[PDB]
Design a binder for this molecule. Structure first.
Ligand SMILES: C[C@H](O)CCCC(=O)CCC/C=C/c1cc(O)cc(O)c1
Ligand SMILES: C[C@H](O)CCCC(=O)CCC/C=C/c1cc(O)cc(O)c1
Ligand SMILES: [K+]
Ligand SMILES: [K+]
Lengths: 267, 266
């Protein structure tokens, strides 16, 4: 596996990883922007004959050398433009993309905005509603935010506490630093940017949508309704918000099978 | 509150309760068939100007005087025929109906099969898939079934353990006896009988569908997809499988507001 950095003309110095040869599959992180969450799955996916690329998101973890605009007032459309910039830098012309949460918003924006570049998109648990309890963390002190959100991740949405904790001290130290960046930059502006207001724009698109099997029905109820209205494939993965952490083998199998489905349909 | 019995010519002697005067609202129990789960909500709903009727289901609790065919190999269509029989016996000509679980299958079967009798139906968490872990309890001894399912209700699907416990010792003593009846008669036959084969049959019907907000997404994921395909109103109630137990006030408000919406549309 390649582990390196690359700078794009928008001022972001990205940390990225890449493994394998074959059609491109790109794994976009969730809002916490931490790509070591994909470590196990990257190898499993690449071994099936794909070139797999992932990266820390701007302002987060090892991609923290970035202009303030890239991690404040963040929207799906901003993130999509940034992901296109690193795909350009890495000479990735066509890609299958995965994303969860703000990453889900991002990959739908990618598919809609850059259809020539995106083979197909997998979106998971895409936030479309403002949640005051999350937005309100943005005015707390840094260490208060990190303590609160570390707790929320572990206890409310990890979908697997043992796997979450087993990410280990190095990863959780980076996440600890990311929580205030995410809190101040994402929850107030990501949900209104959700690229799902136009159901007819989604119809017929190479989009596969998932929600966590154990996720409380209310959390992404709206995803299931919207996908069904648009005739978009909608299904479940085990766990909750982080299937690539809680169930990396099942996650990898899903990404591989879904990419293979669209490679067939393309031909 | 009227608490009484009535015998229908299919051999069932029903225990039923009624309160209030006005348009009829009928509360069909879940598979456990125990109508004291509606106690709080019956009074709240009736107070808003409705005649509310509920009953224990055949073979369950105080409606246990019933032929074996009414609580074995149970289907939505059988249950709907039984509910129509007690509505006939109580001279309830037009009704709003609520049902959860097998009760949900029942009220959708009622709406489709007896459109002239049903003003509107509210269905909650309608089972459409066989679950082997539930079906398999049918072959266990009575006491093991009761122990297993009492635990499942309390800890997994009540949506509110304190409220579940607060049903009280007499209710849980009745449920204790119902669990093996439900296990042997329901899980292997209720899901395949789900009246949701034909989405076009549901389109335009006065149906309001809910799932519990805290219910794991996978449990009734299919409900949300089917309702949306059919253009049916689909939404959430607080809690999980027993909103009338866990959140009786919110439940009653929902039943009242939904009935009022359809009385206006009428
Ligand atoms: C991993 C995730 O991308 C960031 C941590 C927050 C979290 O997991 C809560 C559950 C999912 C919510 C996402 C969400 C919810 C909002 O209201 C606004 C927003 O920008 C994102
Ligand atoms: C209260 C409920 O009506 C009877 C107790 C079982 C339970 O609550 C488990 C969760 C909901 C499942 C209902 C269900 C599931 C099946 O596979 C088959 C079936 O006939 C009913
Ligand atoms: K796994
Ligand atoms: K309540």
């Amino acid at each position: 596996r390649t582990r390196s950095t690359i700078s794009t003309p928008n001022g972001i110095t990205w940390y990225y990883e890449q493994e394998g040869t074959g059609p491109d599959i790109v794994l976009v992180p969730d809002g916490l922007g931490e790509c070591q969450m994909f470590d196990s799955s990257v190898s499993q996916i690449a071994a099936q004959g794909f070139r797999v690329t992932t990266f820390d998101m701007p302002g987060m973890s090892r991609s923290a050398k970035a202009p303030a605009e890239t991690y404040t007032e963040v929207t799906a459309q901003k993130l999509a433009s940034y992901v296109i910039s690193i795909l350009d830098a890495l000479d990735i012309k066509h890609a299958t993309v995965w994303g969860c949460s703000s990453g889900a918003s991002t990959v739908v924006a990618l598919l809609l905005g850059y259809p020539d570049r995106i083979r197909n998109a997998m979106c998971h648990e895409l936030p479309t509603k403002l949640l005051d309890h999350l937005s309100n963390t943005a005015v707390l002190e840094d260490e208060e935010i990190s303590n609160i959100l570390a707790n929320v991740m572990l206890n409310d949405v990890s979908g697997g506490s043992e796997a979450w904790q087993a990410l280990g001290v190095e990863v959780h130290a980076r996440l600890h630093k990311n929580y205030p960046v995410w809190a101040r930059g994402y929850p107030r502006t990501i949900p209104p940017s959700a690229p799902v207001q136009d159901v007819e724009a989604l119809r017929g698109k190479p989009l596969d949508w998932t929600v966590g099997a154990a996720t409380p029905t209310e959390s992404f109820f709206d995803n299931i309704v919207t996908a069904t209205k648009a005739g978009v494939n909608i299904g479940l993965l085990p766990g909750m918000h982080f299937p690539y952490v809680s169930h990396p083998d099942v996650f990898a199998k899903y990404v591989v099978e879904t990419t293979q489905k669209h490679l067939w349909n393309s031909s």
